[PDB]
């Protein structure tokens, strides 16, 4: 099987530090994170269904700029992203954003708590960030998470999943959808021999792994639909500056 | 690199694998052929024992009770301990296999068990079931031992250490059995740098697991002594209740 070539190795070197350089996970995330109080975004014991709480609401929107950000700052550190045109780079930044966020805080999953430990340092359970706002998605997220587990990914292979994410040729608008196109699947072929090269065990693996691909497509999705609840439940000073403009 | 298995080692690698494989039937994979315990059955309503849950475990447990003793059966060092020994080590070891087995065979999308590859449940079913908060103990180990990707021999040798535990109450030959279990487990931590796992301190990580089956393996004694008060004597197996004792 095909290991990286010498070239798919720089662009590996290249995605795996701008990963590790906008990963808020950097410092024992493990050791570091505090755990969100039980209080918060418990079952609440209605018509109509599952109403946001705005309490945890509250404490997920206030760490939630960072998580944005930094999924910014990971495109902008690609080379190939940074030759795209403003426009489509703007269009693959709203289209990934809560894919990759939702990756990030996936692979953070830990089964001895039962939690998610978001941006490193607040660590979740399935109640509190359904409650919190993402609904079913809380439960879609946790599924990956678990899922996840015998995958043992590393930061390249994190960081490579999140540039396939990236360089998304199918997203509406797109005028490069070529050039993009080419980009994914070099992503793809680097990550594919890094796969080989690093031995996993687990049966079909790849083919396993591109269906967490079309996962993280489905929570993106309902991460829309999802953010028109939060628009009518939730008031307008809770909602920082670029949380808003990721879904217009 | 790490030190791998000696010739030696391949050997009673070879053996216990075997004799694990022998009797786990899964030479046609678990999912292709498990069924799914239906939703009404042990359904939610300490707790009281649901009934008919417990009557369709314990319909399939002589079967799994009947593996394990024929397991340790299959090894050599085993046989050739003294009877009573072999009973205190099987009655020590029965329950801790079994939630061994079980819990390989956690299933992450559906979000259960498949007990005997053959019938899977969910963490309510099994707890309602009469194993209380040990079917929550027992989901929990299959949960962190995900990562860990364990193949045939390596939960193989687990079993074979759990066995040879020689810390059990009334045993005879303590010495021998502590030898044959430091066999088990060198061969393992050599197989083990054979394999190279990608989890950090994979090594102690799995030791650890050693520890909550023992208690799970008491868990399970005291929730039998509830089960004894809650479930009329003809939902019992035979094999069932002398294993247990
Ligand atoms: O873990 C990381 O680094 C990134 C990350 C950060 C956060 I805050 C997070 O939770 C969200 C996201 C959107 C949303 O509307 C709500 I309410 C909560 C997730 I999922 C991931
Ligand atoms: O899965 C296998 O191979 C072996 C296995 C078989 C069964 I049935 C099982 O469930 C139990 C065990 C004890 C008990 O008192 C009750 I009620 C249910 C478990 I956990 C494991």
């Given at each position: 099987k095909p290991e990286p070539t010498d070239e798919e190795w720089e662009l590996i070197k290249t995605v795996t530090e701008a990963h590790v350089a906008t990963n808020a996970q950097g410092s024992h995330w493990k050791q570091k994170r505090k755990f969100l109080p039980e209080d918060i975004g418990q079952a609440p014991i209605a018509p109509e269904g599952g109403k946001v709480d705005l309490e945890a609401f509250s404490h997920f929107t206030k760490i939630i700029t960072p998580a944005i950000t930094r999924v910014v700052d990971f495109a902008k550190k690609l080379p190939m992203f940074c030759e795209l045109p403003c426009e489509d780079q703007i269009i693959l930044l709203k289209g990934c954003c809560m894919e990759i966020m939702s990756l990030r805080a996936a692979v953070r999953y830990d089964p001895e708590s039962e939690t998610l430990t978001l941006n490193g340092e607040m660590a979740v359970t399935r109640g509190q960030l359904k409650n919190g706002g993402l609904g079913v998605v809380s439960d879609a997220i946790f599924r990956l998470g678990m899922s996840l587990?015998?995958?043992?990914?590393?930061d390249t292979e994190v960081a490579l999943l999140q540039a396939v994410l990236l360089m998304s040729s199918d997203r509406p608008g797109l005028a490069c959808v070529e050039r993009i196109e080419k980009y994914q699947d070099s992503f793809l072929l680097a990550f594919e021999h890094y796969i080989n090269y690093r031995?996993?065990?687990?049966?079909?693996f790849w083919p396993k792994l591109l269906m967490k691909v079309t996962d993280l497509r489905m929570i993106g999705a309902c991460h829309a639909s999802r953010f028109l609840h939060m628009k009518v439940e939730?008031?307008?000073?809770?909602?920082?500056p670029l949380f808003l403009e990721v879904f217009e």
């Open positions: 587990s015998s995958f043992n990914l590393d031995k996993h065990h687990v049966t079909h939730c008031p307008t000073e809770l909602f920082p």
